[PDB]
From a paper:
Class A β-lactamases, including [name]-2, hydrolyze the amide bond in β-lactam antibiotics through sequential acylation and deacylation steps. The catalytic Ser70 residue attacks the carbonyl carbon of the β-lactam resulting in cleavage of the amide bond and formation of a covalent acyl-enzyme intermediate. Subsequently, Glu166 activates a catalytic water molecule for attack on the carbonyl carbon of the acyl-enzyme leading to hydrolysis of the ester bond between Ser70 and the drug. However, the emergence of the [name]-2 carbapenemase has resulted in widespread resistance to these drugs, suggesting it operates more efficiently.
To further investigate the role of Asn170 in penicillin and carbapenem hydrolysis, we determined the X-ray structure of the [name]-2 [name] apoenzyme as well as product complexes with ampicillin and imipenem. The structure of the [name] apoenzyme is very similar to that of the wildtype [name]-2 apoenzyme with the only major difference being the smaller alanine side chain at position 170, which creates a pocket not found in wildtype and thus expands the volume of the active site in this region. Asn170 along with Glu166 coordinates the hydrolytic water molecule critical for the deacylation reaction. Since sharply decreased values of both kcat and KM are consistent with impaired deacylation in the β-lactamase kinetic scheme, we hypothesized that the [name] substitution results in a decreased rate of deacylation of the carbapenem substrates. To test this hypothesis, single turnover kinetics were performed for the [name] enzyme with imipenem, revealing a modest 5-fold decrease in the acylation rate (k2) but a 2800-fold decrease in the deacylation rate (k3) as compared with wildtype [name]-2 such that deacylation is strongly rate limiting for imipenem hydrolysis in the mutant. Based on this evidence, we speculate that the impaired deacylation of imipenem observed with the [name]-2 [name] enzyme is due to the C6-hydroxyethyl side chain occupying the cavity created by the substitution and displacing the catalytic water molecule.
Author numbering: 25 to 57, 59 to 252, 254 to 295
């Protein structure tokens, strides 16, 4: 049930000038589409979705964690912190920081939550606890986004991303209220309109988390998609390219998502 119908991913990545990695899972039948799915790609900001899930998991054992007010100084305000910069003089709650990290890819929020979990190793430990042996986070924002060719730091594979996303949004890795909160944060993401969402018809529900490194043509998106009348689809699309100055492409991510849905036989656009 893997790649029952071949799709022209190779042509797509050649036109892009780099590598595209795709893993898509039909959670009804278990059928999959897979292209470079076990290669490592930089997570970039896409780690922030798993970060929020790790916070939610901790909130199962610490009641009131999400309501905790967090104060921070100007030195916490990393570039691209569009929400946390507006609350510098007031602070934000853990839940607000988590929503900002997921929905606006807020870097200061992400680093504040990373510190709450014990740093990159703490997030990595959470991923190990759900059975993901591929994920590794090694650094903080923005150093984690160097996207160096061949560097395994701050990477995962499209397959491991999809498998973990399925466990967290649809499976049993989170308790039911925390699972729906994670889904609701992903549904409210504002940064992904030109990526997987551009391949998903307007009448289907969808949540996603993007990542964009800014170098080495490196960008990505993962999503859970609910086509009407059938089981949800989980998918991950990651890209990279050989040269530091190579540009990423949102259109290539959307096109790869379209091919994945076509390969799964999901009638879409």
């Amino acid at each position: 049930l893997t790649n029952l119908v071949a799709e022209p991913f190779a042509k797509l990545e050649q036109d892009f000038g780099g590598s595209i990695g795709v893993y898509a899972m039909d959670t009804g039948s278990g059928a999959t589409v897979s292209y470079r799915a076990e290669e490592r790609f930089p997570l970039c900001s896409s780690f922030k979705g798993f970060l929020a899930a790790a916070v939610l998991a901790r909130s199962q054992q610490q009641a009131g964690l999400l309501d905790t007010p967090i104060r921070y100084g100007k030195n916490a305000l990393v570039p691209w912190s569009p929400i946390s910069e507006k609350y510098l003089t007031t602070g934000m709650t853990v839940a607000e920081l988590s929503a900002a990290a997921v929905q606006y890819s807020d870097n200061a929020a992400a680093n504040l939550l990373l510190k709450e979990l014990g740093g990159p190793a703490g997030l990595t430990a959470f991923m190990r606890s759900i059975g993901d042996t591929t994920f590794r986070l090694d650094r903080w924002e923005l150093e984690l986004a160097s996207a160096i060719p061949g560097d395994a730091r701050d990477t995962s594979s499209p397959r491991a991303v999809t498998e973990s996303l399925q466990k967290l949004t649809l499976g049993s890795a989170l308790a039911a209220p925390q699972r729906q909160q994670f889904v609701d944060w992903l549904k409210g993401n504002t940064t992904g309109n030109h990526r997987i969402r551009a391949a998903v018809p307007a009448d289907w529900a969808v949540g996603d988390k993007t990542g964009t490194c800014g170098v080495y043509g490196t960008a990505n998106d993962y999503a859970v998609v609910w086509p009407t009348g059938r089981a949800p689809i989980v998918l991950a699309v990651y890209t990279r390219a050989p040269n530091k100055d190579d540009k990423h492409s949102e259109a290539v991510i959307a096109a790869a998502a379209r091919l994945a849905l076509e390969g799964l036989g999901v009638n879409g656009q």
